[PDB]
Amino acid sequence: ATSVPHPKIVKKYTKKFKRHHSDRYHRVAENWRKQKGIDSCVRRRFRGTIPQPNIGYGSNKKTKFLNPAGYKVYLVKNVKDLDVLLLHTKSYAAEIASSVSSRKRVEIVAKAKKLGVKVTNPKGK
RNA sequence: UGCUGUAAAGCUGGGUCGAACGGCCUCUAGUGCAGAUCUUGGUGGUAGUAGCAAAUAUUCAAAUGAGAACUUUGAAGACUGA
Numbered sequence: 587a588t589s590v591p592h593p594k595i596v597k598k599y600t601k602k603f604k605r606h607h608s609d610r611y612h613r614v615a616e617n618w619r620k621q622k623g624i625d626s627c628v629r630r631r632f633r634g635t636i637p638q639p640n641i642g643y644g645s646n647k648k649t650k651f652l653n654p655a656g657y658k659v660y661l662v663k664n665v666k667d668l669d670v671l672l673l674h675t676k677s678y679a680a681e682i683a684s685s686v687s688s689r690k691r692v693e694i695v696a697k698a699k700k701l702g703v704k705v706t707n708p709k710g711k
Numbered sequence: 712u713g714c715u716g717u718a719a720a721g722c723u724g725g726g727u728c729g730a731a732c733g734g735c736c737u738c739u740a741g742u743g744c745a746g747a748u749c750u751u752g753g754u755g756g757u758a759g760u761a762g763c764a765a766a767u768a769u770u771c772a773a774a775u776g777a778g779a780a781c782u783u784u785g786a787a788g789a790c791u792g793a
Contacts, residue, residue, distance in 0.1 A: 603718070613745055618718055643717040653714055661722065663734080681714085684723060685733080706714075707723055 588704075589656035590676045595649045603639050653679070659706055665693055671703050679704035686710075 606628045608616040618639060621629040628635045644650075651658050657679035662668055663686060671678050680703050682694055688711050698705050 599717075607745090611745075617720080620718095639718045641717060645716080651715065659714070659722075661734085681723065683733090707712095710724070 587656040588676075589652075592649055592652060592656050593646070595652060595654070595656075596646060598643045598645070599637065601637075604636065606636060653706070655679070655704075657704060657706070662694060664690065665697050668694065668697055668701060668703055672701060675702045675704070679706050681706045682710055684710075 602616070603618045604616045605614060605619045606621055606626075608614045620638070623629060628638070631638075653659055656677075658677060659681045660671060660678050661683055662680040663683045668680060671680055680694075680698055682691055682705065686694065691710050695705060695708060697703075
């Protein structure tokens with residue numbers, strides 16, 4: 587990629603860990619929750635039940651936090667926030683905050699181009 | 712619309728909207744819900760379903776009126792039966 591070379595990015599689990607029975611009742615949100623019931627088939631890990639988060643799924647430390655382009659994304663809220671990315675342009679990319687006005691978003695886009703900083707969401711409002 | 716995190720979650724594109732709000736270092740608590748025949752409010756399936764069958768009984772025409780089985784008048788047929 588255009589960023590600093592990295593090993594191939596491996597995601598051990600690319601699906602979303604969904605809470606058990608969040609498909610069954612509207613009141614049960616999909617935010618992950620661990621089953622604590624005495625009889626739970628999910629907690630006892632029966633064959634055929636949903637996969638559950640555990641530390642074995644952790645990302646390789648050399649590719650953790652990197653987006654598909656190979657950049658670590660940094661939230662930028664103003665022009666002066668781009669300064670800390672001055673020497674890290676091949677490893678860090680700027681993401682303009684959703685609450686930045688259209689006037690200031692043009693200004694941040696212009697400064698980033700001047701400094702060579704990648705912007706992850708150029709096409710904002 | 713996508714991105715990050717094993718995860719709790721975090722960020723972002725588009726739409727809606729109209730007056731406040733956030734990151735970081737700390738402090739503090741009335742701080743996290745699926746259950747308690749939980750509380751209050753709201754809403755379903757059931758379902759256009761059960762049903763709207765006691766007390767003999769109504770009918771023709773005219774008027775009115777946007778509209779008349781159900782209002783008024785006339786003509787009948789009835790009943791309460793002191």
